[PDB]
């Protein structure tokens, strides 16, 4: 099937002991390199929150509800990063634009002190 | 007394990672967040292997870093942790070793040009 691609936006089961526990299925962005995304059992993701619609700290990237088929105008939290078993990935909502992915890269560099 | 010395990028802490624990981890988040944020970002350290197996791995030797055995930093295994989960500071990485972690983190996260 279609490879998980860096920059894709997925619904992901973040519920601890996920199975089908609660409403812990939230949008995330794939930030892992595409070689791991193709062969690894795991991916690395950044959280997306609708709790805010405006960047509050330098690790935030805003994303529009309409273009990216979200339930709210949201923010990518590059300070909230986690490695995820691929079995926790549900549906693929969309993918970020190349310009939007560049904002994510820059915020990732800030977040992890990579300059 | 809880040491007010600030958490720094490259520090090696013992951390409570349950659930998927207490294991060593490397702080990889920027030092401004490390000073003020409720959370840090860490990469896992494992003694299950003693040699880099994939390009996201960085080896660290037991004696230099006060480890129970030769270990590997897994830059494919990243997690954001509440600071409460950090226990004791074990040690911190050399400048060259940290440069290797940066490189493996750029590979892991697809940031290299």
């Amino acid at each position, epitope marked *: 099937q279609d490879p998980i691609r860096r920059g894709d936006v997925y619904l992901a089961d973040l519920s601890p002991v996920q199975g089908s526990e609660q409403g812990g299925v939230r949008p995330v962005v794939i930030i892992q390199n595409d070689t791991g995304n193709k062969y690894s*059992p795991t991916v690395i993701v950044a959280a997306i929150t609708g709790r805010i619609n405006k960047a509050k700290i330098p690790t935030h990237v805003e994303i529009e509800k309409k273009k990216y088929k979200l339930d709210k105008d949201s923010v990518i939290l590059l300070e909230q990063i986690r490695t995820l078993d691929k*079995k926790r990935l549900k549906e693929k909502l969309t993918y970020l634009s190349d310009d939007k992915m560049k904002e994510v890269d820059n915020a990732l560099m800030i977040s992890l002190g990579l300059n | 007394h809880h040491s007010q010395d600030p958490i720094r990028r490259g520090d090696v802490y013992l951390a409570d990672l349950s659930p998927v624990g207490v294991r060593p981890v490397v702080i990889i988040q920027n030092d401004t967040g490390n000073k003020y944020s409720p959370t840090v970002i860490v990469a896992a350290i494992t003694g*299950r292997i003693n040699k*880099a*197996k*994939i390009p996201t*791995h960085v080896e660290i030797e037991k004696k230099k870093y006060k480890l129970d055995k030769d270990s590997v930093i897994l830059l494919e295994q990243i997690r954001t942790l509440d600071k409460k989960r950090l226990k004791e500071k074990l040690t911190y990485l050399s400048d060259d070793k940290m440069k290797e972690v940066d490189n493996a983190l750029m590979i892991s996260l697809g940031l290299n040009a």
Partner: nanobody
Amino acid sequence: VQLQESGGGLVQPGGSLRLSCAASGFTFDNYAIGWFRQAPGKEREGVLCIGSSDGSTYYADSVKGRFTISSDNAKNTVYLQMNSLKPEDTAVYYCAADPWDSGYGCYLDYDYWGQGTQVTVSS
């Protein structure tokens, strides 16, 4: 040996071989497994490699659709099914295995390496 390859030989372009990889003292259960080949004068290359069974198999570009891997139920043997062999495939083939199966692709390092078996494609 602890890993021994077999099942290689000569075959004409288009033929098939099934390389064996026998484990002694341990089973392949939850092991990363890699098949590698080394041509004359060229550096050893990864051909088909499995890290985690929850990940995906890596194939060298030339070998996808021709080479597949399988186990021996008892998991004491691993097989490289090599179909549609081309002269480019002439080399010594190795199997390798590692207890750490949380990775993917062909590992930079494997704890256990076989001795090698010769494969030649020509007619």
